[PDB]
Symmetry: D2
Subunit: 355 residues, 4 copies
């Protein structure tokens, strides 16, 4: 059942670059991503909105495409050279995956691009060529109190984390942190190319589903302001979880829900991982500071809800149920538990979440 | 039932000044307030620790007094003149309250002071005279990433909020914000002298009990650091609620628990209330943004748990039960309700707390 | 030349409330205060713009009034009761000052108001009645990265600081901080009613002139953002001084210049002064951490330039020259001196400013 | 011209640490540990080894007691052990003096190569290093001014294009630079790790070390360092700032250690890891290029820098810049700068911005 390593060389992946999300009401989505969140328009028409963060120079970090069923259509990684698109094609072909190459791109402002149904059922895109736009990094006349400054990562729900981890490691992603138990189950892994804690991450669950797309801010007060704004707009019900400090990654975070329930994380101030012997951190699944360092409870919807993903024909990918133990069940379910201090019943929670 | 307005003039109260808290293990409490929270020691011996915030010049903002039963011993307000302590004494005597006056103070660093058992059963102190100490407001060589800069307010649990409110208004406190419902019930009120949202507040519940004492920080990141530090110390279980943004008050906040479960709020960035026609804001009790503006749920312990208070002899005040509706029950209990948008079923909660 | 204490009781002043500035080009001024700084419009027409801060509930904190000569037309203080406007009139009449009373106000959204040519030549207004507006304190859908949240203070240039200080003390302002030297000269004083470091302040120099109006932010990053935005708009030449940490007041600060060179300070995180025995802090004029705690030099324009003020007829008040020693001259001038550490030659400056600079 | 070797360049990850010679170890310890809050990895009577809050390698700064304060080595970590062999072959082909120590020059570094590079600078290349407790979640230690990473070095060298070409051959990519309309280069910034820079060249007499830079999380952390220095009554050791840079867009501060070694505190520059990352060239007369808010650049910033040592520990001879001086063309008596290109309003002629002339 393992995914064999191709003999063909892996493409040299720089970073996560953009996501294409199918949305059902383009105007409602535009209000969320432009008016609430302040992303910058790179192109729009009656069918699509192309958006970028404050410090981006490539054409976009987010494409909103009107469609009948809300879903992730592609999660796109930029590769180092044009020849790396050829490498990506040969690599996935050797893996036995369905691939589609468009020499003029799938979306505006991207050139030669390869989309694939990857071995975990996810629609990945690889591209080098992209239309450069004005880098807005010093446009403080446009800067919002909640400004989103970079695209940081994706998070994928998949049933077998070790299987997916090994596949991503072969593609050159390096694991930085993970969550395990003493019995040897892996519940989640984080992995990177660009020298932050992650470009993508695997959350154990029924999949393929897209858990979230994450944008960063400069400072913690910028995340606070997003929350404050949502309260002023009386859409606080769309704040799912946070704001908090993560255990894994050490980042300050917030999770919010778009009009189609696509989950967006806002994230800041993780650490440098670019050294090849970067120390890998393993948390125990029962540690109540692993996800929220302050011990705040993880709402069940965070574990159970995630976005559909599409195949290359635009149809929804069938889901495979996780057979490994469930993080939700072992921590906050009827027979779950967590601790503040390992071995101490004081500050422990049994069959219950924290707080 | 109503508390009459005295003929005697009310004392001119400046602000909340300090609390004296009884604690059971002086060493454990010191470690919390000094090592974890960073408050500054004005004086300490084997029985008491006198602590002050970064910007304070009066002797202290907090006195920890070792004793057998953890409780509030005195909540103190400073008055404008020495003659206002005379006014306070005559005022509470007309109210028929027990009073006790000491020209040399009850605690170190306070001179002529009046303590009273007020009409709600709380131990109030009024004083003018205090020993000035080094104001540490520019001692950035001492400044902590979580620095507590000022004492901001107290919050009192009392069963009948309107009764208490009228009494505090006659005493010169002005109501800035409150929480009511559509059936004539008041659940909470905030009231001030110094021109911030409050110097004290009333929370409807069984009482007298002390809900919390609140200290300010300069910035929101200072509150975040307190949380981060508690995680590093592996004492995140002592974070009760927050961090968040309040609806009422608009302040950024955090609630933590000391070793005797006394609740401390960290608070920043409320607004100016010093004009006498300052607009009074009333929230509906079912508005899920009233306590946490982001809609985060209020944990039941925040409603049910609070500190004992002492009388002037040092004995615990008997608790009188609230008969008015319970904010817990009407918002997050089995028959509770809250809304995100008034009149919208979407984003409303029936018989449970927000966010799952 | 002491100003006597009246027998008539002083009005009970709450706080500074608004300033009326005469501006020469209303559109250019609106661009600065609304588009650059983010203040909120309460009312406007062809002649005036009425602006308020994020947390204000009275009608306005600033009125911009088109006129031929840019100047301060009124610094306004709110009093506690309607009766305090009568008290103000009686008080200033006893002081021998010219006064003008308008039962329906001088500017929109203010009711019964008294304006006075005060003993230092400044146009003060006292009022209680004002039209309440929507308080925007939780309108985070409007909140700017540089949001101005309150009006904090005024600062006045006057030739004789002790004379003015005594008069303001009789009026009920308490001095929180001052700058003096060891030879009896007062260079500046800060004084309050509302329980912050100040509602107004006196800066020694030729006057009457208005030094600045100050607005506060929530946090230091908000002030940084104003600077950053001015850079992006390529108007960094309108940043006069800062950003910095003050010694006096301990506030984080920035000084900028509007289209008519009216100086605006942005300010945050001073301390509580409401207790009646609040300790008064006196800094020595030669302490190089007194104005900028980090030792950064005070640009000469900060000491020399300030706005004209008008009398009740709208004519510019004549300027009276300061004869006391000049803060500029004694610190950064040719015979000037400043220290980092009292009594240490190392980190001291002789005949020049700090950090490697001299007067242009 | 410095030729491109046939031998492959070592794969450089990032700047890693500097070794600074200091004259009074206790006074230097007070500055770096007590004032700035850096974390001790090792110390004795001869040296102090210091790391930032988020570091896992042994150290980011070695303070070595010696007779003459100077930079002794600026060290870059390479990707594999074999890259140290590549460094050695590369610099030997360049004709540079090299010294190889299989067990390191300083504690907590293993196999290492030091070289006197073509610009006169003592560079070290290493892979092997002793891992230590990564303190990134130790909020019980976190100070209000916490220094979280080593970010970069800045080198003073007389001929910027000559140095830039050599660094490009070594794999560094230019992100930003400062030039004039007549083709003079005043400064260039260049990176390996995907930030604006790992090292930078400032036109001037050299070799000299301009500064070492550490990062903070947020801008308020830099403000606190200034506030703390005021409280300690050492504001005279704040040289320049705080400010926002034009070049790099980072929030910054420059301070001076007890031997006048300049330390920058820096935060919130941008991502440069894509290979077609857009370069940005600023005009030397643009008064927003160094401080975005137009604050004047203090003359000492342009004239003063640290000595550097050769592999024997002797001070490297200084070679004079012959290209135009940035100080002179901008803030000297014949200099000029502008706020808006072509606008006399907001321009400065023969003095610095904001009303000052040179002291
Ligand atoms: O600790 N977890 O909950 C994490 C850590 C990093 C992330 O970006 C995330 O989405 C989850
Ligand atoms: O803009 N300059 O002054 C710069 C920009 C970045 C730096 O790291 C520096 O030392 C100077
Ligand atoms: Ca003298
Ligand atoms: Cl609340
Ligand atoms: Cl000043
Ligand atoms: Fe994430
Ligand atoms: Fe409170
Ligand atoms: Fe001011
Ligand atoms: Fe630098």
């Amino acid at each position: 059942n393992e995914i064999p390593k191709p003999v063909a060389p892996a493409p040299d992946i720089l970073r996560c670059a953009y996501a294409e999300l199918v949305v059902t009401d383009l105007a409602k989505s535009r209000n969320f991503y432009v008016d609430v969140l302040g992303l910058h328009v790179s192109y729009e028409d009656e069918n699509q909105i192309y958006l970028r963060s404050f410090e981006e120079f490539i054409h976009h970090n987010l494409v909103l495409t009107k469609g009948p069923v809300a879903a992730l259509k592609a999660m796109a990684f930029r590769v180092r050279t044009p020849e790396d698109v050829d490498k990506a094609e040969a690599y996935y072909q050797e893996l036995g995956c369905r691939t589609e190459r468009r020499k003029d791109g799938f979306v505006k402002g991207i050139g030669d691009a390869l989309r694939v149904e990857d071995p975990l059922g996810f629609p990945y895109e690889f591209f080098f060529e992209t239309t450069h736009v004005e880098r807005l990094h010093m446009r403080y006349d446009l800067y919002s109190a909640g400004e989103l400054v970079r695209l940081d990562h994706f998070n994928q729900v998949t049933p077998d984390v070790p299987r997916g981890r090994k596949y991503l490691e072969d593609l050159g992603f390096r694991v930085t942190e993970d969550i395990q138990d003493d019995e040897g189950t892996t519940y989640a892994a984080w992995m990177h190319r660009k020298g932050t804690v992650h470009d993508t991450a695997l959350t154990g669950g029924n999949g393929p589903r897209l858990h979230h797309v994450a944008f960063s801010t400069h400072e913690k007060h910028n995340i606070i302001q997003i929350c404050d704004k949502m309260g002023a707009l009386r859409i606080s019900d769309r704040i799912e979880r946070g704001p908090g400090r993560h255990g894994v990654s050490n980042a300050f975070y917030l999770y919010i829900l778009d009009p189609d329930n696509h989950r967006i994380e806002i994230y800041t101030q993780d650490y440098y991982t670019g050294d090849p012997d970067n120390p890998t951190i393993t948390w125990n699944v029962h540690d109540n500071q692993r996800r929220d360092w302050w011990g705040n409870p993880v709402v069940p919807s965070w574990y159970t809800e995630a976005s559909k993903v599409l195949d290359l024909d635009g149809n929804v990918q069938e889901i495979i149920e996780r057979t490994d133990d469930s993080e939700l069940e072992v921590t906050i379910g009827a027979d779950g538990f967590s601790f503040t201090r390992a071995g101490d019943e004081d500050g422990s929670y049994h069959g219950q979440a924290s707080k």
